[PDB]
């Protein structure tokens, strides 16, 4: 006869969700938040003979990252001055001192009556605004968000510069990692390991090109939830970076205005030197080679004799239409069409626009005002992937068009988190044995 034997410490687990905590290695928000020290010795345990199922499109780690980022962002802006005394009629004319012709009409010089230290007195001040920040009332203008939202000035001392962060399991939980090179995001993964914390991920936000992510181990990878359903996005991970050099080639003056009792507004003052358009430099040859690699891989799902064409976005608000880029403390909206105009069978120099009043998260009630950054800005970053959408399909054309559709803030993070899964450890269990308790 056999009897039940109870074992505690059995190495088994179930799929599970739990809050993960952040850890990492100034006035930076990420540094302040992920105050927990990182793992100085990030040991990884190979699990011999373990096959596990992963699904990046259902991976709740991305949802947590999204929610926590929004929360951190709001806590950072919560205590900053509210620019409600600023929603006034502005009297504006164009900036005309040293305007090159591609900048004409983009930068405006606006005068207004603002509250001083005492509530009994007004002062006449002026500042510069970008065209996209200001709308006409009918030379009478108002800030673009006056009839929908409050405008909060971001504090000039707070840094949002991305710092790699690591997600770590709480006790009783573990994170499994997929090491199967060329894993497509779903189904079984034959080679896995157990870790305590994820690798570092930079909490970068972008809309069309994916910036400063990890690279594919061997070849360009193409992943999609459905692939054949044209309503879904296609994520492309490059196995090599494309270097992109961006600039806002001006000399800004920051000026401070008291708007109340210790309440300061940071305004954009006169530009020293020429006024020029913001732009990004993408190496032409590099872009042509990595695009060619993407096409070679796209064909696996579309056909070896199918024409693959790239085209620009369909149009609409700049948040989706253009490549939104946050760097140097300024918000850029880059045209991007020079990167997606080819048919498959030196430099590019993409123009960019600058905007200061940003509705960053897709919410209506609150807008953030980015104070100007003094001086001149230079940014160098890696394009590590693309968010593409497909316009119809080859069905009755033998031609397909791909566009830099973008559209989901989470897509810039699931592209890093696709290798990780959270599981719950369940140590108690039973099995029959050839023994009996002797009472």
């Amino acid at each position: 006869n056999l009897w039940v034997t109870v074992y505690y410490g059995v190495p088994v687990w179930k799929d599970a969700e739990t809050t993960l905590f952040c850890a990492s290695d100034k006035h930076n928000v990420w540094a302040t938040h992920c105050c927990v020290p990182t793992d100085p010795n990030p040991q990884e345990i190979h699990l011999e003979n373990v096959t596990e199922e992963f699904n990046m499109w259902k991976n709740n780690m991305v949802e947590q990252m999204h929610t926590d980022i929004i929360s951190l962002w709001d806590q950072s802006l919560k205590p900053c001055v509210k620019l409600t005394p600023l929603c006034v009629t502005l009297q504006c004319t164009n900036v005309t001192n040293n305007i090159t012709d591609d900048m004409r009409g983009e930068l405006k010089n606006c005068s207004f009556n603002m509250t001083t230290e005492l509530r009994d007195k007004k002062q006449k001040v002026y500042s510069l605004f970008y065209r996209l920040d200001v709308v006409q009332i009918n030379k009478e203008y108002r800030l673009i968000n006056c009839n929908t939202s409050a405008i909060t000035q971001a504090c000039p001392k707070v840094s949002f510069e991305p710092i790699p962060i690591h997600y770590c399991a709480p006790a009783g939980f573990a994170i499994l990692k997929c090491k199967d090179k060329k894993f497509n995001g779903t189904g079984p993964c034959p080679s896995v390991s157990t870790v305590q914390c994820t690798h570092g991920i930079k909490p970068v936000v972008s809309t069309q090109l994916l910036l400063n992510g990890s690279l594919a181990e061997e070849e360009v990878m193409i992943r999609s939830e459905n692939i054949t359903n044209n309503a879904k996005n296609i994520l492309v991970q490059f196995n090599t970076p494309v270097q992109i050099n961006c600039t806002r080639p001006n000399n800004n003056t920051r000026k401070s205005i008291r708007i109340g009792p210790g309440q300061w507004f940071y305004a954009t003052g006169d530009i020293i030197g020429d006024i020029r358009q913001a732009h990004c430099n993408v190496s032409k040859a590099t872009w042509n080679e990595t695009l060619g690699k993407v096409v070679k891989q796209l064909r696996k799902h579309f056909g070896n004799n199918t024409i693959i064409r790239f085209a620009n976005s369909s149009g609409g608000d700049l948040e989706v239409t253009t490549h939104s880029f946050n760097c140097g403390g300024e918000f850029f909206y880059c045209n991007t069409s020079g990167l997606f105009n080819s048919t498959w069978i030196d430099s590019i120099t993409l123009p960019c626009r600058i905007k200061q009043i940003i509705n960053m998260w897709q919410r209506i009630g609150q807008a953030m005002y980015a104070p100007p950054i003094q001086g001149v800005i230079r940014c160098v970053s890696n394009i590590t992937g693309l968010i593409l959408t497909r316009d119809g399909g080859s069905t009755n054309s033998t031609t397909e068009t791909f566009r830099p559709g973008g559209g989901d803030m989470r897509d810039n993070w699931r592209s890093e988190l696709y290798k990780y899964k959270v599981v719950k450890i369940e140590p108690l269990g039973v099995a029959p044995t050839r023994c009996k308790r002797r009472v």
Epitope: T96, N97, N98, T100, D101
Partner: antibody
């Protein structure tokens, strides 16, 4: 420093065409915008056309709309103007000039263009 | 016909003081800056004044100027026979997108 306007003009009969060209030296051609200014003999100056340094923004004066076309190379440090359907009224000295917002800065040489029988 | 207008002649002085002026409308001088050019017979114009009152490099204290309303002026305190030229004002026009000039004022020193 100089334009060394190339004298791509000359004598043309009405209805014909001429292409004016302009060089650049001591000037980082690819950075600044440029324009053409016309001066009839015995008359004051008038604007004909302009082009931005990127080559993307182009404007023309009313009397030459349709007929004239302006372009830039940006590798050879040169600029040009193709003037089609020339009229007697277009006889003038044409000047090549470098500009900044709201003013002309570097002017030079000048080319006589004559339209006649 | 110039978009801007100005007197055909200012040859009424010697003795270190003459004023040359021009005018437009709110679509031009009233909304943007004014520049002045000096043309000697036989050559290309030289820049004297830009952005209302800044001297171009190489321009002496003999020249000055200002802008008000929808009009502007050039002040010359030299009037040596060296300052013999056709002077023009110019400005960016907003309806006609370009940098346009007035008729030109001829100044001969007495």
């Amino acid at each position: 420093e100089v334009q060394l306007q190339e004298s791509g003009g000359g004598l043309a009969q009405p209805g014909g065409s001429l292409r004016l060209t302009c060089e650049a030296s001591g000037f980082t051609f690819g950075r600044d915008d440029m324009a053409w200014v016309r001066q009839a003999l015995g008359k004051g100056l008038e604007w004909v056309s302009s082009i931005s340094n990127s080559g993307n923004t182009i404007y023309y004066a009313d009397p030459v709309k349709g007929r004239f076309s302006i372009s830039r190379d940006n590798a050879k440090n040169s600029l040009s103007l193709q003037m089609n359907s020339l009229k007697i009224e277009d006889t003038a000295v044409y000047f090549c000039t470098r500009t900044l917002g709201d003013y002309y800065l570097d002017w030079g040489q000048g080319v006589q263009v004559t339209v006649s029988s | 016909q110039a978009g801007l207008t100005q007197p055909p002649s200012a040859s009424e002085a010697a003795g270190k003081s003459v004023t040359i002026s021009c005018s437009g409308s709110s679509a031009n001088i009233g909304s943007t800056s004014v520049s002045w050019y000096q043309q000697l017979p036989g050559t290309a114009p030289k820049l004297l004044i830009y952005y209302n009152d800044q001297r171009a490099s190489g321009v002496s204290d003999r020249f000055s100027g200002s802008k008000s309303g929808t009009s502007a002026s050039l002040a010359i305190s030299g009037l040596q026979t060296e300052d013999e030229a056709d002077y023009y004002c110019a400005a960016w026009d907003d309806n006609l997108s370009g940098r346009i000039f007035g008729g030109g004022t001829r100044l001969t020193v007495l």
